[PDB]
Amino acid sequence: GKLLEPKRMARVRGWRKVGAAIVRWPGPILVGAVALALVGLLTLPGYRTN
């Protein structure tokens, strides 16, 4: 019957928009993501176990 149907689609539109953003200006977005990654990484070397 009718059990697997799409309704109220609003995800692929937003993700195409973020695709447009990520293709046009890759430099700034890449550097921002790397910045967050470095914020994550710097805490690593000080790490103790119990």
């Binding site: 692929v12 993700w15 973020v18 990520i22 293709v23 890759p26 430099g27 890449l30 993501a33």
Partner: protein
Amino acid sequence: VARLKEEIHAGINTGIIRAMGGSGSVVTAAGLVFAFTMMSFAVSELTVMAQVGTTIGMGLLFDTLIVRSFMTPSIAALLGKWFWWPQVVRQRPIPQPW
């Protein structure tokens, strides 16, 4: 990567944006569902299993929302046609008449 490889023939920019619009939503849905199912272990009394649940949940949240949605497609788009070496690919097809 497989989905990206599928639709790279009509340029690389259009290919990246279509691969996003087509599979970013799916990967993000799966990642979020599993990440929060693993975050529900925080309220657990046992500390080891709460720690594991939180570690995995935060890991998947960071992976899905930043590393995989902004960082890898950005590297692909930046490197352009040298993302498929040693295969030879055109960065955009022959222009078509209006």
